[PDB]
Symmetry: C2
Subunit: 207 residues, 2 copies
């Protein structure tokens, strides 16, 4: 407990309703958490997406300092303009989630998470933990991930030219179509399989 | 054996097909000489006093062999050197422009040369065609290669500091176990090229990339 198996539908969430609480195995369909204070709040095994209406929940402008989502379905979630310093998103589905304007000032832990088609445009995520994610079709234009750990990632259908990746750890990942002739990889960590992969693209055989 | 010629013009058939050892040839003129199947071993062709070399321009060098010779400043211009063997030689500043290492054969151009363990510093290979040849363990400091093609040749074990990688065709070359100087993979056509793991990590550093591990 003491907040297990809630089932909300279409509600506007009171600002202090969940602050610093732990919430488990609950469903929130089309709920409006905008401006909500979710500091130190922890959701575990919760569903925030309605496959019926195809609606996510609204978290825009929410206070999310030290919030934690663990094994949650955050598909289509709207995290725009939220304050998310130290947020943890672990083992979640976050397909189509929208992080534009969210601030992480950096500290953030988004790991083992499906970020396919998520929107990170202009976002600043420097020296953060962003490992073992799925990034297929994620929008990252103007973003910076500089210095972050992105290792273990899946990056097909992902535009490596669109954001700042200098100083990133990219090891043990599926790089997809990264061309070292047109991408600034100063300070980046790669492994030897990846180095060979990127050189093969130039027609070189590494032996 | 132990010949010691100075300033001579060499008769065309003087040395054809013969084995010459531990001899010196200072300021001699082998121009147009027939040196097919001729083998020189431990011979000096460079006069360290007069600082002059020998002239082999337009010589017939098909299947000639030079081993442990000093061919410094040697002039090989416009010679015919199909299948030539130059091994463990000093050849600093030798001039190979217009030299031919090839001929048309019946089943196509067949190119063939063995230049190995040889100092080619400052040698001139401008426009030379040396494709699919054995060219390994050579020193190439300051060699001029503009317009040359080495395509498909084995250049492994080479020293390519101070060497213009943009000047010549290196596609399909074996470049492994070599000091690559300022080779940069972003600016040179390296299709079909073989490099080893150590070189790859070095070349990646040039891009600021760390390769583990």
């Amino acid at each position: 407990g003491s907040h297990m198996a809630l089932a909300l539908v279409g509600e506007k969430i009171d600002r202090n309703r969940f602050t610093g609480e732990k919430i488990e195995n609950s469903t929130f369909f089309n709920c409006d958490f905008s401006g909500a204070d979710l500091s130190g709040t922890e959701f575990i095994g919760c569903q925030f997406y309605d496959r019926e209406s195809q609606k996510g929940c609204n978290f825009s402008r929410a206070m999310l300092k030290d919030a934690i989502f663990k094994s949650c379905d955050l598909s289509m979630a709207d995290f725009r303009n939220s304050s998310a310093l130290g947020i943890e998103i672990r083992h979640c589905r976050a397909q189509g989630a929208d992080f534009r304007g969210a601030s992480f000032r950096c500290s953030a832990y988004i790991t083992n998470t499906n970020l396919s088609y998520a929107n990170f445009s202009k976002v600043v995520l420097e020296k953060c933990e962003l490992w073992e994610n799925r990034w297929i079709g994620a929008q990252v234009l103007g973003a910076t991930f500089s210095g972050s750990d992105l290792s273990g990632g899946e990056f097909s259908t992902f535009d490596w030219r669109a954001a700042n990746f200098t100083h990133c750890d990219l090891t043990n990942s599926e790089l997809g179509d990264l061309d070292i002739r047109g991408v600034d990889l100063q300070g980046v960590k790669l492994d030897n399989y990846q180095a060979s992969l990127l050189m093969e693209r130039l027609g070189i055989a590494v032996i």
